[PDB]
Amino acid sequence: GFKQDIATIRGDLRTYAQDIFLAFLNKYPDERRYFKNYVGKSDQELKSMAKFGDHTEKVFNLMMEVADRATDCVPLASDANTLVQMKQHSSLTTGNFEKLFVALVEYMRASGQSFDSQSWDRFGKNLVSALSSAGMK
Amino acid sequence: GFKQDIATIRGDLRTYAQDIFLAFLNKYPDERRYFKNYVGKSDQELKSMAKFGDHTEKVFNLMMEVADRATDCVPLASDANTLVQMKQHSSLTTGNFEKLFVALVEYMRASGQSFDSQSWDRFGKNLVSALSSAGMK
Ligand code: HEM
Numbered sequence: 001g002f003k004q005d006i007a008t009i010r011g012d013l014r015t016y017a018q019d020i021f022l023a024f025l026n027k028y029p030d031e032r033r034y035f036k037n038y039v040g041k042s043d044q045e046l047k048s049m050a051k052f053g054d055h056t057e058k059v060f061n062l063m064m065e066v067a068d069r070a071t072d073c074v075p076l077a078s079d080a081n082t083l084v085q086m087k088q089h090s091s092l093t094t095g096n097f098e099k100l101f102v103a104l105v106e107y108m109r110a111s112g113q114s115f116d117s118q119s120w121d122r123f124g125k126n127l128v129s130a131l132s133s134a135g136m137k
Numbered sequence: 138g139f140k141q142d143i144a145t146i147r148g149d150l151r152t153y154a155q156d157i158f159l160a161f162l163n164k165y166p167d168e169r170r171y172f173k174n175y176v177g178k179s180d181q182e183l184k185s186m187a188k189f190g191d192h193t194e195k196v197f198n199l200m201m202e203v204a205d206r207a208t209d210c211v212p213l214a215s216d217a218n219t220l221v222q223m224k225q226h227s228s229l230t231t232g233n234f235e236k237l238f239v240a241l242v243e244y245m246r247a248s249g250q251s252f253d254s255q256s257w258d259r260f261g262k263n264l265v266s267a268l269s270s271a272g273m274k
């Protein structure tokens with residue numbers, strides 16, 4: 001289930017973080033415009049860029065703490081306040097986060113593994129709502 | 138589902154509030170001691186005292202508000218805080234709230250109606266967890 005999935009991804013974090021983030025950027029090529037130095041590059045080229053590995057893992061390290069602090073896939077208000085107040089997220093709307101979660105859940109459905117992709121969808125929806133309450137447009 | 142149930146209870150709040158509360162006290166007769174003016178009365182004697190219906194309705198009114206504000210059966214931290222620092226609740230522990238929820242879910246299962254009894258179960262467990270986080274013993 002959901003609590004297991006957190007452990008599964010933590011167990012091979014850099015592989016999953018890069019694979020899911022590439023899934024997102026290939027499914028929504030427009031989203032790359034927030035990520036300047038990723039335009040123009042094949043997946044193998046991004047995987048050899050230092051910043052891409054480093055940053056994507058830090059995104060997923062935090063997503064996993066937010067997921068791990070949640071009760072029934074409902075995140076903490078203070079975690080959503082964090083996400084809205086980060087300077088790197090100040091250009092964003094909840095729609096960007098909705099698209100990330102759609103790529104994430106699609107990735108889990110197509111994969112080998114037995115993820116609880118229905119919970120990840122619910123977590124995504126609860127998170128978008130919590131971002132709305134903390135102020136993000 | 139859970140949102141329908143809240144509409145069902147609010148529809149006939151005073152009848153549900155009397156019936157569920159009586160179910161509670163009779164299932165857990167040692168809890169009656171908290172309610173000084175209810176000692177030594179039968180169900181029908183209580184249902185005939187206007188201030189019995191008046192208190193209980195107020196209790197279940199706030200319970201539905203807390204339920205309605207919850208996301209996927211998880212209550213707001215602030216609602217939990219209100220319940221702990223009400224001067225009327227000063228000497229209670231989470232065990233008292235657990236019993237009310239056991240009675241409440243048993244009532245729902247035994248009734249004609251199709252309540253989402255598993256979600257009320259989840260809701261009670263989540264509120265008790267929140268009450269302790271607000272420092273109830
Ligand atoms: C729950 C989802 C998300 C989490 C936990 C998260 C977390 C983070 C973190 C921890 C950083 C700093 C990374 C670093 O220092 O290396 C970051 C940066 C950034 N984030 Fe997110 N993020 C999320 C969703 C999104 C979405 C959906 C977008 C936009 C499409 C986005 C856009 C950005 C941008 C533009 C940066 C700066 C670029 C970079 O640091 O590589 N984030 N995010």
Ligand code: HEM
Nearest residue numbers: 168171172191192195196197199200225226229233234237
């Ligand atoms: C989620 C559950 C509960 C809610 C929403 C709630 C709420 C309330 C409210 C709103 C009142 C004031 C009634 C009024 O002013 O007319 C009250 C009174 C009171 N409550 Fe609770 N309560 C809850 C659970 C409990 C439990 C489980 C106990 C003990 C077993 C308890 C013990 C008392 C006592 C002793 C009073 C004052 C005497 C009375 O009015 O009957 N409460 N409660």
